[PDB]
């Protein structure tokens, strides 16, 4: 039967690299492997498919596919949850990777529900760019200073950066 | 600084035992440790506190407490999330344990949000009572047969049982 | 088929508690479970067997046993390795728990070989009794002071204690 | 202070990829990172150093290096163990990756001792090329058939291959 593996953590934790590592094990086992993302060994290669909408997944013929990866799952909405549940019901090994929290430390839909329903959950940590300890947050900086709680995701002409930080060095500025 | 560790999995996965194991490490380190639950080494013992409401946690003086456990967190509502966030902000190591899903395979509030915000997440599996493989679900049986999707949690006079099952042997009957 | 799971770590890491947790999953799956150590749910209970010698394991009829635990494996010599390999070959789930290192930080036979050959390996950490960080060592103290590199395991009339410590607070005194 | 992380598993388990993933977290934290192997982000890149002998490690000036990777550690002998112990004593985060067992299922020196002494140990599994279950072994095939227990590592003109297999599909032929 099928199952779901969930890979999560902050922006700099290497989630996507870990997803690919797991998928490449499929290749060496002579399995057919695909990875969906927001838009090789002895002849066997990961088939990568760029998508704009979660619903696109079901338009592909996956009957002969053993392992299905889905990267950056926070890009999609709650629809991806039932898709993943159906795929694993159908007998596929499904591996999903995405952010646990945004820059504000707010949970990123739909990872919470995916973590709750998945057979396996791995939360990867990064390393704090301030102190070098294990980190769990992503610090957004705008013009050198911590982003404010109500700063929009998209800006025009702003100097901005992201870095991994531990809880102790993560700052969300007041609105 | 503080952090949150999340222990989750099905009813028969040993979540509570794992919570206690982690807390007892605190004891051997000569830390002060408490565990809250829904209602010892060289003199140092886990202080267990039975509570009916999440809000009770904040009525206790925890200033000198190093490690705070909270068991069966699915008993509480979303209020427990900000409490846990505050406690870890305050510098405590907070360890929460609770169910990931109910008998229907539906996510059990508030574990999804807690998993999303926690530094560490461990999903424990049990062993399937049918086939002996790793299990992730809890099968509810009423009068020998799989519970229906819309069966109430409380019954009068029903023969009922729970057992660990893998996805392949977990059955939710139609309504 | 069978496999071997290895649980290791320092004296105060809760290895034995973790072993029991895993074994109790067997019970809830209605499996027959035994645990060997150096010398219950719905009728199904862990059968505990106290032994002086590794060779005793093979004198017991284990044909109907699903899960075999062996605690404190550092008590036994290298003979336990082939026994464990045979048991897992025979189709048993074998779970072994024991110390990784002694008070000197020296590897404790036969755990290194067992870790190398096992399908799964879990190294548990404790909490440092000095600083509260994750610990990997056991500090032996004799008359208040770090034990010396060539201090014997057995003493007469000595004041001695053990506590968990991180590498940074673990001290082995010169001979 | 420093510590040692050990990454192990069979030939097709992705050990080297996991090593690189961990090292790249160092980069994003603005740490100085090097990787030794048997013979980039915002200006910061992993410095890779090809070596023939473990003793070469100590001829490099590592005083300003935060994280030290060592890949394919089974290439080196027991000398690498004290080198790694010294480096971690010196305050470095040391990450070692290497094979747990050879094609015969025999422990590969010096990984057993490294696993015993390290703070963290991760054994990665691959996927069985026969049955698709989790695998822990590497099957060596010579002229289509399982390699014999006493077949040499080096051959002239032999058709040979390696594939990941579970214990149940791993075969070592009699001598
Ligand atoms: Zn920090
Ligand atoms: Zn089953
Ligand atoms: Zn310490
Ligand atoms: Zn197989």
TrEMBL record, chains A, B, C, D:
<dbReference type="GO" id="GO:0008270">
    <property type="term" value="F:zinc ion binding"/>
</dbReference>
<dbReference type="GO" id="GO:0005829">
    <property type="term" value="C:cytosol"/>
</dbReference>
<keyword id="KW-0237">DNA synthesis</keyword>
<comment type="similarity">
    <text>Belongs to the thymidine kinase family.</text>
</comment>
<keyword id="KW-0963">Cytoplasm</keyword>
<feature type="binding site">
    <location>
        <position position="162"/>
    </location>
    <ligand>
        <name>substrate</name>
    </ligand>
</feature>
<keyword id="KW-0479">Metal-binding</keyword>
<feature type="binding site">
    <location>
        <begin position="154"/>
        <end position="157"/>
    </location>
    <ligand>
        <name>substrate</name>
    </ligand>
</feature>
<feature type="binding site">
    <location>
        <position position="128"/>
    </location>
    <ligand>
        <name>Zn(2+)</name>
    </ligand>
</feature>
<dbReference type="Pfam" id="PF00265">
    <property type="entry name" value="TK"/>
</dbReference>
<feature type="binding site">
    <location>
        <position position="131"/>
    </location>
    <ligand>
        <name>Zn(2+)</name>
    </ligand>
</feature>
<feature type="binding site">
    <location>
        <position position="169"/>
    </location>
    <ligand>
        <name>Zn(2+)</name>
    </ligand>
</feature>
<feature type="active site" description="Proton acceptor">
    <location>
        <position position="72"/>
    </location>
</feature>
<comment type="subunit">
    <text>Homotetramer.</text>
</comment>
<keyword id="KW-0418">Kinase</keyword>
<dbReference type="GO" id="GO:0004797">
    <property type="term" value="F:thymidine kinase activity"/>
</dbReference>
<feature type="binding site">
    <location>
        <begin position="71"/>
        <end position="74"/>
    </location>
    <ligand>
        <name>ATP</name>
    </ligand>
</feature>
<keyword id="KW-0808">Transferase</keyword>
<dbReference type="GO" id="GO:0005524">
    <property type="term" value="F:ATP binding"/>
</dbReference>
<dbReference type="InterPro" id="IPR020633">
    <property type="entry name" value="Thymidine_kinase_CS"/>
</dbReference>
<dbReference type="InterPro" id="IPR027417">
    <property type="entry name" value="P-loop_NTPase"/>
</dbReference>
<dbReference type="GO" id="GO:0071897">
    <property type="term" value="P:DNA biosynthetic process"/>
</dbReference>
<feature type="binding site">
    <location>
        <begin position="9"/>
        <end position="16"/>
    </location>
    <ligand>
        <name>ATP</name>
    </ligand>
</feature>
<protein>
    <recommendedName>
        <fullName>Thymidine kinase</fullName>
        <ecNumber>2.7.1.21</ecNumber>
    </recommendedName>
</protein>
<keyword id="KW-0862">Zinc</keyword>
<dbReference type="GO" id="GO:0046104">
    <property type="term" value="P:thymidine metabolic process"/>
</dbReference>
<keyword id="KW-0547">Nucleotide-binding</keyword>
<dbReference type="InterPro" id="IPR001267">
    <property type="entry name" value="Thymidine_kinase"/>
</dbReference>
<keyword id="KW-0067">ATP-binding</keyword>
<feature type="binding site">
    <location>
        <position position="166"/>
    </location>
    <ligand>
        <name>Zn(2+)</name>
    </ligand>
</feature>
């Amino acid at each position: 039967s099928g199952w779901i593996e969930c890979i999560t953590g902050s922006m700099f934790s290497g989630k996507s690299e870990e997803l690919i590592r797991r998928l490449r094990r499929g290749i060496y086992a002579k399995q057919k492997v695909v990875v969906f993302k927001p838009a090789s060994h002895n002849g066997n290669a990961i088939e990568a498919i760029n998508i704009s909408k979660a619903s696109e997944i079901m338009t592909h013929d996956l009957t002969n596919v053993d392992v299905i990866g889905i990267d950056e799952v926070q890009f999609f909405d709650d629809e991806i949850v039932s898709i993943v549940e159906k795929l694993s019901a159908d007998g596929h090994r499904v591996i999903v990777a995405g952010l646990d929290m945004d820059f504000r430390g707010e949970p990123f839909e739909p990872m919470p529900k995916l973590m709750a329903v998945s057979e396996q959950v791995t939360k990867l940590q990064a390393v704090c760019a301030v102190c070098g300890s294990s980190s769990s947050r992503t610090q957004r900086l705008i013009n050198g200073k911590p982003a404010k709680i109500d700063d929009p995701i998209i800006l025009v002409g702003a100097n901005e950066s992201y870095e991994p930080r531990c809880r102790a060095h993560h700052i969300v500025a007041p609105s």
